[PDB]
Every structure is written in structure tokens, then in C-alpha cells.
Amino acid sequence: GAMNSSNYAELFNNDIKLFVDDTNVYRVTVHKTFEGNVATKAINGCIFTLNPKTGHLFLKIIHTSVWAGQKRLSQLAKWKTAEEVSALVRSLPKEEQPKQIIVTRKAMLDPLEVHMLDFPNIAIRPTELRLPFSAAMSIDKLSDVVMKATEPQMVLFNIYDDWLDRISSYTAFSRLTLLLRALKTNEESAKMILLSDPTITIKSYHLWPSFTDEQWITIESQMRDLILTEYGRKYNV
Amino acid sequence: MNTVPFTSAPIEVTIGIDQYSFNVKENQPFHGIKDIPIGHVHVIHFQHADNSSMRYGYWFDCRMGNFYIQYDPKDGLYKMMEERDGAKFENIVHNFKERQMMVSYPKIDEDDTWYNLTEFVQMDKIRKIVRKDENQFSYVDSSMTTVQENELSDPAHSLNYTVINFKSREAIRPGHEMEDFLDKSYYLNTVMLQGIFKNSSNYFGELQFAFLNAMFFGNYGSSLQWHAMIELICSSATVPKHMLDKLDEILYYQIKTLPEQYSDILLNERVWNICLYSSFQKNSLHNTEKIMENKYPELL
Numbered sequence: 157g158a159m160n161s162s163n164y165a166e167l168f169n170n171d172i173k174l175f176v177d178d179t180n181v182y183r184v185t186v187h188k189t190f191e192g193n194v195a196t197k198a199i200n201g202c203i204f205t206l207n208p209k210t211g212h213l214f215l216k217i218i219h220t221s222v223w224a225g226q227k228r229l230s231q232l233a234k235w236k237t238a239e240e241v242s243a244l245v246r247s248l249p250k251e252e253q254p255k256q257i258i259v260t261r262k263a264m265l266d267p268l269e270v271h272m273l274d275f276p277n278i279a280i281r282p283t284e285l286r287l288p289f290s291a292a293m294s295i296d297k298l299s300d301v302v303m304k305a306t307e308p309q310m311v312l313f314n315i316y317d318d319w320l321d322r323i324s325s326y327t328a329f330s331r332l333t334l335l336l337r338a339l340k341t342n343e344e345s346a347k348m349i350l351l352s353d354p355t356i357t358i359k360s361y362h363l364w365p366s367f368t369d370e371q372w373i374t375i376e377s378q379m380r381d382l383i384l385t386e387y388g389r390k391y392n393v
Numbered sequence: 394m395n396t397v398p399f400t401s402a403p404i405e406v407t408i409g410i411d412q413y414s415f416n417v418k419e420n421q422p423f424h425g426i427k428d429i430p431i432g433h434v435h436v437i438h439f440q441h442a443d444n445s446s447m448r449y450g451y452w453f454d455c456r457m458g459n460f461y462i463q464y465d466p467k468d469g470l471y472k473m474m475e476e477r478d479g480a481k482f483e484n485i486v487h488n489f490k491e492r493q494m495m496v497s498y499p500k501i502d503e504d505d506t507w508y509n510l511t512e513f514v515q516m517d518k519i520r521k522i523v524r525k526d527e528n529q530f531s532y533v534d535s536s537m538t539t540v541q542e543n544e545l546s547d548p549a550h551s552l553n554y555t556v557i558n559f560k561s562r563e564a565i566r567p568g569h570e571m572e573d574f575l576d577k578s579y580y581l582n583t584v585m586l587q588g589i590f591k592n593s594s595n596y597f598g599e600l601q602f603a604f605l606n607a608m609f610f611g612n613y614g615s616s617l618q619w620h621a622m623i624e625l626i627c628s629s630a631t632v633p634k635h636m637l638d639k640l641d642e643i644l645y646y647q648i649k650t651l652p653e654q655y656s657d658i659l660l661n662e663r664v665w666n667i668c669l670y671s672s673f674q675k676n677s678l679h680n681t682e683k684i685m686e687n688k689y690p691e692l693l
């Protein structure tokens with residue numbers, strides 16, 4: 157059934173599994189027309205299909221041409237998400253296929269179940285966790301590859317960089333979700349924190365800065381403050 | 394006009410014959426039902442006074458044999474049997490009729506209710522859903538499970554309704570996943586109508602039989618089947634016009650006959666709201682929508 161706070165450690169066991177987040181698949185800007193009506197212009201999007209045990213973010217870039225001449229795009233986006241996830245499970249050799257796919261939004265369940273009928277042994281699960289994966293497009297290197305794409309493309313990022321050399325998957329996922337929740341609540345502040353000090357750099361092959369263990373503790377504390385801060389700025393506490 | 398004699402009535406029982414019901418007292422000198430209309434299937438059904446658990450009954454067509462009821466004190470139920478000695482049967486029936494020991498099938502001339510509920514129901518198709526080949530009539534009860542229910546346990550006592558499953562490879566063409574799931578026309582028209590049922594008459598027959606088993610026996614799997622067969626049509630954008638018009642008449646008479654007090658258990662809110670208000674056919678079932686809105690406006 158559903159994945160929640162009670163069964164949180166299941167994410168880090170030795171079944172291969174993928175979180176699928178569809179919140180950035182269909183992206184638009186809303187604007188006025190010359191006649192004063194409103195219209196949308198789609199921009200490139202992405203499916204966020206992440207591996208909890210290694211930090212690998214398997215980003216399928218959704219190019220705006222996939223919407224051309226289509227209707228009911230928010231509904232189609234869920235089916236396109238499911239089609240592309242299914243195509244990834246099939247490309248994979250068998251021992252590498254995930255065992256479970258957890259969707260971050262319940263509206264993805266039926267589309268994914270239908271597309272995965274050929275895989276009756278892969279469990280399709282919802283979650284009660286409010287995961288901040290929508291903020292993935294606040295990671296500069298991910299946003300850049302999505303916006304630059306001229307055609308459909310699959311581009312990967314171990315989203316944990318090299319953290320697993322020093323920390324466990326549980327701790328890596330907790331750091332990732334803290335960083336992303338921060339970026340989601342106040343992207344400017346969050347990014348200031350991450351880049352305030354010009355001596356800590358992001359390696360060319362990484363997404364996040366090369367913080368020491370001690371610096372990560374400082375960073376992580378600042379992100380908690382920012383989140384608590386914004387939670388006061390928001391509710392006046 | 395045919396007759397189903399009873400050897401006796403040793404236990405107090407509510408007896409149904411089609412949409413009619415009457416009470417018979419323990420050891421009442423009652424010897425059966427006469428004046429049964431020829432040309433339709435019929436159901437004779439039972440609820441014991443001492444144990445309302447297990448409604449049970451028999452589907453039959455008097456054109457296929459001479460049938461009677463006899464209580465079995467070992468198995469504790471009224472059993473239908475066939476009498477092969479036609480002369481014995483005629484002699485028994487004539488005596489019981491002469492002694493006025495029969496209820497008369499109480500059909501009003503104006504009344505087409507039973508025809509309208511069984512228009513497409515054929516005994517030969519009932520006997521393929523309910524498999525007991527040595528008898529010409531078919532036993533059904535409240536507890537019998539369906540083949541689909543059993544896939545999710547005695548196969549010989551199962552209701553072999555056609556399996557309908559909207560999230561199944563049978564229902565969904567590879568490469569048409571969104572199309573087939575959101576518009577079920579290919580599953581309705583190609584897989585089920587052309588492939589399995591052969592024609593809409595057989596589809597409606599099974600739909601009507603499922604409803605009647607739900608209504609008369611409280612058979613939960615039959616109710617599931619009836620709603621699934623409605624939903625499959627309502628969720629298809631392309632349905633022959635004669636089928637939609639006939640479905641509206643079918644459902645109207647089913648809704649008209651349903652006891653007011655059983656609507657809570659026999660009607661699935663999601664299916665009906667979806668079919669009447671959101672589906673492709675939300676504007677194609679005028680008679681059914683009108684009776685539902687006037688008789689069960691709470692459900693909606």
C-alpha cells in the first residue's frame with residue numbers, strides 16, 4: 157500500500173526502487189494575448205525518477221514538441237509520464253528493473269498501473285510523504301539541461317554526488333529532502349546559503365558544493381533555520 | 394399456462410416467484426404455483442422463516458420440462474426436481490388444482506414488468522453461467538461467488554459471469570493505454586461484443602440476469618457484475634445507438650422494480666454518478682436518469 161513515516165526505512169533496503177515525480181512534466185507560462193485573453197506557452201519539462209539507495213536522478217527531459225496539437229495536456233502529461241517510466245523499466249535488464257515504483261502524486265497511480273500491466277510483479281505505490289521533488293528545477297545544472305534541450309532526451313545526475321562514500325543512504329536522502337524543501341520554501345535564501353562562501357566549489361561532475369562533513373552540518377542547520385524562518389514569515393510566529 | 398407443484402411445505406418459508414412473494418406456514422397444506430406465463434424464464438425463490446440467512450432459488454423455463462418442488466429434510470431446503478413421467482405430473486397437477494391448493498401467478502394484464510426485466514435472458518445462457526448440466530434448471534443463492542471473485546473457492550458452485558476488468562491486458566491494447574482506459578469502446582465493441590458475447594442481446598441478457606440475482610438473492614458478486622457491465626457501456630464513447638436506447642429501458646425497469654429499502658446496498662454511488670453525470674453517455678439515459686433522480690436523489 158502507501159509509503160509513509162511508519163515504513164520510511166524501506167526506502168533504503170536492498171530492493172531496487174524509483175520515486176517518480178511528475179510535477180515538472182507539463183510546465184507553462186501564462187500570459188495575455190493581444191486581444192486581452194489569456195493563453196499558455198509550454199516550456200520544457202522533466203520526469204524526476206530517483207533511486208533512493210545511490211542518489212542517481214534519472215531525468216527524462218520532456219520537450220515542448222510532445223504537446224503540439226494535443227488536448228487536455230495536464231491529463232496527457234500523466235500518461236506520458238507513465239509511458240516514459242514504463243519504457244525505462246523495459247530498457248533495463250531484468251535484475252536492474254525496480255521492484256516497486258512509488259509515485260509522489262496519487263493521480264499517477266492508474267496511468268502507471270495501466271502502462272505497467274506487462275510487469276504484474278512490480279508494485280505501484282502511493283505515498284503519504286510530502287516530498288519536495290518539485291524543487292528539482294531549482295538545481296541549476298538540472299534546470300540548465302532541461303531548458304537547453306532541443307529534442308526529447310534522457311540525462312542523469314547521481315543526485316547525492318559522492319556523499320555515499322561518507323554517509324548512508326538514509327542520511328543522504330534526508331540531506332537531499334532538506335535541501336529541496338529549503339529551495340522550495342525560499343529559493344533565493346536557500347541558494348545564497350549554498351553559495352555564500354566563494355571558496356567551496358561545485359565540481360564539474362557534481363550538482364552540489366564540495367562541503368566538508370563539518371560544513372554540511374553548518375549548511376544543514378542553516379537550511380532548517382530558513383525553513384523555520386519562512387514558516388514564521390508565512391504564519392507570523 | 395404452466396404449473397410448478399409442491400409435494401408439501403413442511404417448513405415456514407417466504408416463497409418468491411419472479412417479482413411476487415407470499416408467506417406459507419409450517420405444515421400448511423400448500424401445493425404450488427399455477428398459471429405461470431409461458432415464454433419467459435422464471436425464478437422461484439425461498440427464504441426460510443427460521444433462518445433468513447441464505448436466500449436461494451431456481452431459474453427455470455417450463456417449456457423445457459415439468460418441474461416440481463420437494464422439501465429435503467436432510468439438506469434442509471426446498472429442491473427443484475424434474476418429473477419425467479408426464480402422465481404422473483399431469484395427474485398430480487390436476488388433482489392439486491381441483492382441490493384449490495395453489496397460488497395463481499398474479500400477473501396484471503397491463504403489466505410488462507417481468508418481460509421488461511428478462512427481455513434478453515435465455516435459459517440456455519443461464520445454464521452456462523450456472524454449471525450443473527444434469528438439470529434443466531439452475532440453482533442460485535446469496536453466498537455463491539463469481540469466477541472473478543474467486544481469482545482475487547469451490548468452482549462447481551460458482552457464477553461464471555464474463556470477467557470484466559478495466560485494468561487488464563484484455564481491456565487495454567499495447568500502445569493504446571490512455572486511449573483504451575479513458576474510452577472503453579474497443580473493449581466493449583471488439584473484445585466483448587464481437588469477441589465474447591457475439592451480440593448485444595447476449596450482453597444484455599447477462600446484465601439482466603446479474604441484476605436479478607443481486608436483487609432476489611442479495612448476491613454481491615452479481616451486483617458487481619451488473620455495475621461493471623453498465624460502466625463498460627457508459628465509459629465507451631462509441632456505442633451503437635440502439636444499444637444505448639435499449640440500455641436506458643433496461644435500467645429504467647430495474648430501477649423501477651428495486652425495493653426502495655435495498656437501494657443503499659444494491660446501488661453503487663460511484664458507478665451511477667459517473668454513468669449519469671460524467672461519462673460519455675451522461676446524456677443518453679434520459680429515462681433512467683429521471684427515475685433515479687426522483688426515486689433515489691440521495692445516492693446522487
Ligand SMILES: Cc1cc(C(=O)NCC[C@H](O)C(F)(F)F)on1
Pocket residue numbers: 415416417422423424493494495496
Ligand atoms: C399465501 C398463500 C395462499 C395459498 C394457497 O394455497 N391459496 C389457495 C387457496 C387456499 O388454498 C385456500 F385456503 F384458500 F383455500 O398458499 N399460500
